[PDB]
Design a protein around this ligand. Structure first.
Ligand code: J8D
Length: 238
């Protein structure tokens, strides 16, 4: 992810088949001739897509030009949360399935995984960051407090951002309950709120290298969203 001053990011295509699949996902959803109401509605929850991009001197080097959803914030607090019960896709080998389940064996149980966070602390004018090992260390016993940390600025719990996040996620949940054409594996929600205004958050769906056509509800994704909403809801009683 390369941040560009113009308010966009350049996401480098992942190696094949993942990069190519994410490109085709964005191209499908943002097709200029698309009249699919499910897909038109989905656009509301994704970063705006500005097409494929590569450097002038390097046609080989492929990127997705996307809206930087953090650009309108002064001190953006950012959390990446993987959603679903399975983070492997329907066509993974036994070895790949095993590797993906071992990366976080509670995925089925919890339905989501914190990939990282960057939280602005008001008193020090500084950020505290957590890497992938933070969320992977969380269990049922510690997920509520694990998620809460994102919304604590060193002085208070930002319950305004927690409540706004629930409301934004609820619209995404509604979309998932009104579609049976796509299932999403190893995809995330990107949470952003203002660290420095009240109730102002972004929640956007990202990471689409394992989105597949389907005939059914994405049950794993629904479970994950529901559980995530429940955890956030409990944090409002802190
Ligand atoms: C300084 O930290 C960040 C700043 C911006 C982002 C960011 C911002 C984005 O808008 C974004 C996106 O649209 C798609 C995507 O796959 C990833 C994205 O990441 C992520 C960050 O960790």
């Amino acid at each position: 992810i390369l941040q560009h001053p113009d308010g966009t990011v350049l996401k480098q295509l992942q190696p094949p088949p993942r990069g190519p699949r994410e490109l085709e996902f964005y191209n499908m959803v943002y097709a200029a001739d698309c009249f699919d109401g499910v897909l038109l509605e989905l656009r509301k929850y994704l970063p705006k897509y500005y097409g494929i991009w590569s450097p002038p001197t390097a046609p080989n080097d492929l990127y997705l030009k996307l809206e930087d959803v953090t650009h309108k914030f002064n001190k953006p607090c950012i959390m990446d949360v993987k959603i679903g019960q399975k983070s492997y896709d329907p066509f993974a080998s036994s070895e790949k399935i095993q590797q993906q389940v071992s990366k976080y064996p509670l995925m089925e149980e919890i339905g989501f995984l914190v990939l990282g966070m960057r939280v602005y602390h008001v008193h020090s004018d500084s950020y505290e960051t957590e890497n992938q090992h933070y969320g992977r260390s969380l269990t049922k016993e510690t997920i509520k407090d694990g998620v809460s940390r994102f919304f604590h600025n060193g002085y208070c719990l930002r319950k305004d951002a927690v409540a706004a996040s629930i409301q934004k996620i609820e619209k995404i949940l509604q979309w998932f309950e009104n579609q049976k054409q796509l299932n999403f594996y190893a995809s995330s929600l990107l949470f952003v709120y203002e660290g420095s205004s009240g109730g102002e958050v972004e929640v956007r769906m990202i990471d689409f290298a394992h989105v597949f056509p389907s005939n059914t509800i994405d049950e794993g994704y629904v479970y994950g969203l529901k559980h995530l909403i429940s955890v956030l809801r409990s944090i409002l009683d802190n």
